[PDB]
Amino acid sequence: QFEERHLKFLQQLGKGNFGSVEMCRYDPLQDNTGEVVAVKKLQHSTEEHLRDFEREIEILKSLQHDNIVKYKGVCYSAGRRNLKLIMEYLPYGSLRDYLQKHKERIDHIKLLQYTSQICKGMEYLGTKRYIHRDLATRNILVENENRVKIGDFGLTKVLPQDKEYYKVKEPGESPIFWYAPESLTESKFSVASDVWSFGVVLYELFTYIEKSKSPPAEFMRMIGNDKQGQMIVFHLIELLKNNGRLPRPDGCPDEIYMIMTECWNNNVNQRPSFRDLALRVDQIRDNMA
Ligand SMILES: CCS(=O)(=O)N1CC(CC#N)(n2cc(-c3ncnc4[nH]ccc34)cn2)C1
């Protein structure tokens, strides 16, 4: 539904290997009245990455929720080459950058509002049997000061109809410091591993994205900054197997840290549900108010 000739590039909003997102104006009348949109494209579009991208687009189109970024459409040139995903543009960028840049004005009650919205989005995913696999504040977007949305679904998988986990090992770097132990050891991803990652997101929020307090920084100190290459993963596994954990962030109340530590249960089946997480967070919010 979008013609590429009418997409006007404004700036880059994000870039990894395999993908990037741009701020563009969609201006079919060419009179500078069109709306600004976000445009995701692949960076090294192998056929495998293209099939994954088409599945990612279908997943996002199937999702309709206040805390999930809105699908708008697709754009392609020359037959169907250089597929692009069109999404609503959210003006405050990623929650990671937003929180870092406005930490002095964002209090704990606001952090818990964001936490509750992220839980509701994840519960919605879970009802569709979708496993996100990449939950992190860098993949959460800020629509306004009172509303956040899960913003990227590049790694999201649909569970088989007969199993409660999905096994996958992607070649390349993996956000291992957000991964549940069974995801590190067995490449097993589930609603429960998303819950483990959600605990890491909650940690991130209460660190306010302070430099040396990031999960990678804290875990690398705990295993020794000398560890190199593959040993990193091995040592992380051993650390988590012995119940090594990220510390309580400065100023974090004990009850919030306790939500984190319960998400970080080595026993997959004893981690809370996203509905229970939302319930506990919302009760704490109400107590604070
Ligand atoms: C895999 C690296 S990436 O470039 O594809 N990636 C997605 C990313 C993280 C998230 N979410 N990103 C999205 C935006 C963004 N900003 C403003 N409005 C928006 N609408 C839809 C996306 C969006 C900014 N960064 C950075």
Curated annotation (Swiss-Prot):
Domain of life the protein comes from: Eukaryota
Binding residues annotated for ATP, in chain numbering: 13-21, 40
Domain notes per entry: Possesses 2 protein kinase domains. The second one probably contains the catalytic domain, while the presence of slight differences suggest a different role for protein kinase 1.
Main location: membrane
Tissue: Ubiquitously expressed throughout most tissues.
Subcellular location(s) per record: Endomembrane system; Cytoplasm; Nucleus
One GO CC annotation: focal adhesion
Record's disease association: Chromosomal aberrations involving JAK2 are found in both chronic and acute forms of eosinophilic, lymphoblastic and myeloid leukemia. Translocation t(8;9)(p22;p24) with PCM1 links the protein kinase domain of JAK2 to the major portion of PCM1. Translocation t(9;12)(p24;p13) with ETV6. Budd-Chiari syndrome: A syndrome caused by obstruction of hepatic venous outflow involving either the hepatic veins or the terminal segment of the inferior vena cava. Obstructions are generally caused by thrombosis and lead to hepatic congestion and ischemic necrosis. Clinical manifestations observed in the majority of patients include hepatomegaly, right upper quadrant pain and abdominal ascites.
Keyword Lipid biosynthesis among record annotations: no
UniProt name for this protein: Tyrosine-protein kinase JAK2
Keyword vocabulary terms for this entry: Adaptive immunity, ATP-binding, Chromatin regulator, Chromosomal rearrangement, Cytoplasm, Disease variant, Immunity, Innate immunity, Kinase, Magnesium, Membrane, Metal-binding, Nucleotide-binding, Nucleus, Phosphoprotein, Proto-oncogene, Repeat, SH2 domain, Transferase, Tyrosine-protein kinase, Ubl conjugation
Single Gene Ontology MF annotation: interleukin-12 receptor binding
Active site: 134 (proton acceptor)
GO biological process, one term: erythrocyte differentiation
Post-translational modifications: Autophosphorylated, leading to regulate its activity. Autophosphorylation on Tyr-26, Tyr-124 and Tyr-130 in response to growth hormone (GH) are required for maximal kinase activity. Also phosphorylated by TEC. Phosphorylated on tyrosine residues in response to interferon gamma signaling. Phosphorylated on tyrosine residues in response to a signaling cascade that is activated by increased cellular retinol. Undergoes Notch-induced ubiquitination and subsequent proteasomal degradation which is mediated by ASB1 or ASB2, the substrate-recognition components of probable ECS E3 ubiquitin-protein ligase complexes.
Stated family: Belongs to the protein kinase superfamily. Tyr protein kinase family. JAK subfamily.
Organism whose genome encodes this protein: Homo sapiens
Subunit structure of this chain's protein: Interacts with EPOR, LYN, SIRPA, SH2B1 and TEC. Interacts with IL23R. Interacts with SKB1. Interacts with STAM2. Interacts with IFNGR2 (via intracellular domain). Interacts with LEPR (Isoform B). Interacts with HSP90AB1; promotes functional activation in a heat shock-dependent manner. Interacts with STRA6. Interacts with RHEX; this interaction occurs in a erythropoietin (EPO)-dependent manner. Interacts with ASB2; the interaction targets JAK2 for Notch-induced proteasomal degradation. Interacts with MPL/TPOR.
Gene name as annotated: JAK2
General function of this protein: Non-receptor tyrosine kinase involved in various processes such as cell growth, development, differentiation or histone modifications. Mediates essential signaling events in both innate and adaptive immunity. In the cytoplasm, plays a pivotal role in signal transduction via its association with type I receptors such as growth hormone (GHR), prolactin (PRLR), leptin (LEPR), erythropoietin (EPOR), thrombopoietin receptor (MPL/TPOR); or type II receptors including IFN-alpha, IFN-beta, IFN-gamma and multiple interleukins.
KW Coiled coil (keyword) present: no
Domain Protein kinase: 7-282
Phosphotyrosine: modified positions: 26, 124, 130, 165-166
